[PDB]
Amino acid sequence: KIQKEGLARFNKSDAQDGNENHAVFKRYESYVRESQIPSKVKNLRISIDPKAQTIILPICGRPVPFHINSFKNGSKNEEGDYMYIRLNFNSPGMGSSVKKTELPYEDGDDKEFVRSLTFRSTNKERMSEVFKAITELKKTAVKRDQERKTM
Amino acid sequence: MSTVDFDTIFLNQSKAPGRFRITSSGLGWKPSSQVPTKGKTDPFLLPSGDILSVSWSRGYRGWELRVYTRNDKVIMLDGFEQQDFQQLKNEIQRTFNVNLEHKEHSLRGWNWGKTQLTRAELVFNVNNRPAWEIPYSEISNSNLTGRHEISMELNPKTVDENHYETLGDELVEVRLYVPGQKSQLFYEQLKDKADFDTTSEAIVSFEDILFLTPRGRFEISMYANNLRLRGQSYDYKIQNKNVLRIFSLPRLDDRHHLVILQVDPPLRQGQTRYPFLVMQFDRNEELEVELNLSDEEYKSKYEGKLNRSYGTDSTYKILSHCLRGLTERRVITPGSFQSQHMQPGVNCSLKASEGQIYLLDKCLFFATKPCVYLPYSGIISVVTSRGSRTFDIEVQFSGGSHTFANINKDEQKPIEDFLKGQGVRVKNE
């Protein structure tokens, strides 16, 4: 009875119409315009925008935004007079615990990814505060995304 | 002749502001005399003939003028206002016959894109817009750290007699992930364009060395200042200064010999770190090796430190001597400790990991992942506990305790007498 019931419920036309759950890239963006970059950013240093959920990194004299959803995790190391921060970003291979249905990046075999950036600074205290604030911003983002999924 | 000048402009991320000037002879920049910059006060001058192209884009301190030279160098001038664009465009066009290009950058915050090796800079594009560019002159080294992973080290901006003090947080290392069967070709093309030192002459190479931490068949190429480990998936460059200690320890199987390198900073493979490199040799493995050195360089630098040729001796001895001569580190051999079985070490378990403990003259050393080095000067007390044909040793130090379990009870007295002889406080529950 169940064999026939299943054969009736599922037709070969439904099999042809396969709603492949292509991973739905959750589209996020840090800024649309250069005028949205805060005036504070000017000391060629790491800065955090909690409003735009964005980490701004000093790459070769340019204020490069990275959205908190592209950020995976980081580490901090003290070495002589300098403090090092390594920031790791989401890439295939080094994947996060997210399911196959929703990727933090758009699907692409030809896409290359920034896997990690390592910075150094003479000021240890501020660099420790910046790392704490990045980690807190990630916790708040993950909590809001869980709350959304539960709702 | 209308000289156009801009005050408060910075050269290559300089801490001090300067005065920028455009002349028919070229570009000039001079630091403003108000800051005691231990440093030449000499004006930077770029001839008009060396200018190839000029781009205008958003920098940290306002707008940035990026000048591409015919000598594959990039000059960065930051601190311009948005109004300066019209004046700069007209003056650069009039003086050099070069178009000022406005380059918009990606602000999306995505870490994916396409890399593009341009003549003087590596460009990372996000949605057909540049997110960032790195001049090849800022890249110190590049190294494949994964079938799909490329690590670029950047020149540390410290103290050089020719560079202005930089202001801010400095980028030291960039790691890219290049999927597809593609990262090796990208690495080769980056090497050709960045013009890295070429015709390198390894002093000595050792092929097919089986490591244990991490396990792999690495080729070891030795140079004057650095050691290279080449592997099927990961290449490592270790500076000779970063080698802290060399251990040369016989395995208790009496068939193998361990050579162990302590490296600081510890080697990275993705997220895992290797502070100790553990190599495993056969004791019967013999190798003949001639050093690739000129007779003048050998006599001047390496006489009495290295042999010109090593005869057919055991590979681990030749390697240990070469490492001693190039790193100037002392090789630590087994100490005066002899087990009841006349062995140089004892079998034990550290947590779930089975291994061998060596009681060396200055330190206790465990040689199986994880590798544990304990200097006697850091040990507060050793407690022997009864689990029994076996007993356990808890070593207490200022940073915690390590329990070595499953040690044969016959080895208890030799270990206690040796540790008391080294001045370590032994407590017996």
SS3 of chain B: the string is: CCCEEEEEEEECCECCCEEEEEECCEEEEEECCCCCCCCCCCCEEEEHHHEEEEEEEECCCCEEEEEEECCCCEEEEEEECCCHHHHHHHHHHHHHCCCEEECCCCCCCCCEEEEEECCCEEEEEECCEEEEEEEHHHEEEEEEECCCEEEEEECCCCCCCCCCCECCCEEEEEEEECCCCCHHHHHHHHHHHHCCCCCCCCCEEEEEEEEEECEEEEEEEECCCEEEEECCCEEEEEEHHHEEEEEEEECCCCCEEEEEEEEEEEEEECCEEEEEEEEEEECCCEEEEECCCCHHHHHHHHCCCCCCEEEEEEHHHHHHHHHHHHHCCCEECCCCCCCCCCCCCEEEEECCEEEEEEEECCEEEECCCCCEEEEHHHEEEEEEEECCCEEEEEEEECCEEEEEEEEEHHHHHHHHHHHHHCCCCEEEC
Cα distances from B57 to residues B87, B108, B307, in angstroms, run 15, 16, 57
Q: Least CB-CB distance to A111: which of B112, B175, B265?
A: B112
- As given in the structure block, the two tokens for residue B248 are 């040369």
Mutate to test the interface with A, among B12, B82, B102, B110 (most CBs of A within 10 A): B110
CA distance A5 to A23: 32
Q: Are A121 and B58 inside 8 Å of each other by CB? A: no
CA distance B13 to A42: 11
The residues, any chain, with a CB within 8 Å of residue B107's CB and separated by 6 or more, are: A29, A30, A31, A32, A33, A34, A36, A37, A65
Helix/strand/coil for A140: helix
Mutate to test the interface with B, among A45, A115, A131, A134 (most CBs of B within 10 A): A115
Rounded to the nearest angstrom, the minimum Cα separation between B311 and chain A is: 42
Q: Are A29 and B109 inside 8 Å of each other by CB? A: yes
Q: Are A66 and B111 inside 8 Å of each other by CB? A: yes
Chains A, B: CB contacts within 8 A come to 166
Q: Are A110 and B175 inside 8 Å of each other by CB? A: no
- As given in the structure block, the two tokens for residue B362 are 């200055």
Pairing of strands B353-360, B346-350: antiparallel
Contacts A138 to B, Cβ<8 Å:
none
Contacts A34 to B, Cβ<8 Å:
58, 105, 107
Pairing of strands B400-408, B346-350: antiparallel
Rounded to the nearest angstrom, the minimum Cα separation between B152 and chain A is: 10
CB atoms within 10 A of CB B223: 16
Cα distances from B156 to residues A5, A46, B17, B77, B263, in angstroms, run 71, 17, 22, 20, 20
CB < 8 Å from A in window 68-127 of B = 76, 78, 105, 107-115, 124
Contacts A125 to B, Cβ<8 Å:
none
CB < 8 Å from A in window 145-164 of B = 148-149, 156
Q: Are A61 and B78 inside 8 Å of each other by CB? A: yes
Q: Are B171 and A58 inside 8 Å of each other by CB? A: yes
Q: Least CB-CB distance to B131: which of A37, A64, A118?
A: A64
Rounded to the nearest angstrom, the minimum Cα separation between B204 and chain A is: 32
Helix/strand/coil for A131: helix
Kindly state the DSSP code that residue A124 receives in the 8-state scheme.
H
Experimental method of this PDB entry: cryo-EM
Contacts A58 to B, Cβ<8 Å:
60, 168-171
Q: Are A44 and B148 inside 8 Å of each other by CB? A: no
Resolution (A): 3.8
Contacts A127 to B, Cβ<8 Å:
169
Q: Least CB-CB distance to A60: which of B115, B135, B178?
A: B135
Q: Are A93 and B171 inside 8 Å of each other by CB? A: no
Q: Taking CA atoms, what residue in A is nearest to B147?
A: A93
The residues, any chain, with a CB within 8 Å of residue B236's CB and separated by 6 or more, are: B143, B145, B228, B229, B267
Kindly state the DSSP code that residue A24 receives in the 8-state scheme.
-
Contacts B242 to A, Cβ<8 Å:
none
Rounded to the nearest angstrom, the minimum Cα separation between B58 and chain A is: 7
With b meaning 16 or more CB within 10 Å and e meaning fewer, what string describes A29-50?
bbbeeeeebeeebbebbbbbbe
Contacts A28 to B, Cβ<8 Å:
109
Q: Least CB-CB distance to A44: which of B58, B105, B167?
A: B167
Q: Taking CA atoms, what residue in A is nearest to B135?
A: A60
Q: Are A45 and B168 inside 8 Å of each other by CB? A: yes
Cα distances from B207 to residues A77, B226, B276, B373, in angstroms, run 34, 17, 20, 28
Q: Least CB-CB distance to A41: which of B60, B124, B166?
A: B60
CA distance B274 to B339: 29
Contacts B170 to A, Cβ<8 Å:
58, 119-121
A84, A76 Cβ separation under 8 angstroms = yes
Kindly state the DSSP code that residue A53 receives in the 8-state scheme.
T
Q: Is B242 on the interface with A (CB under 8 A)?
A: no
CA distance B323 to B54: 49
- As given in the structure block, the two tokens for residue B380 are 């507060």
Contacts A121 to B, Cβ<8 Å:
168-170
CA distance B269 to A83: 21
Q: Are B138 and A60 inside 8 Å of each other by CB? A: yes
Rounded to the nearest angstrom, the minimum Cα separation between B77 and chain A is: 9
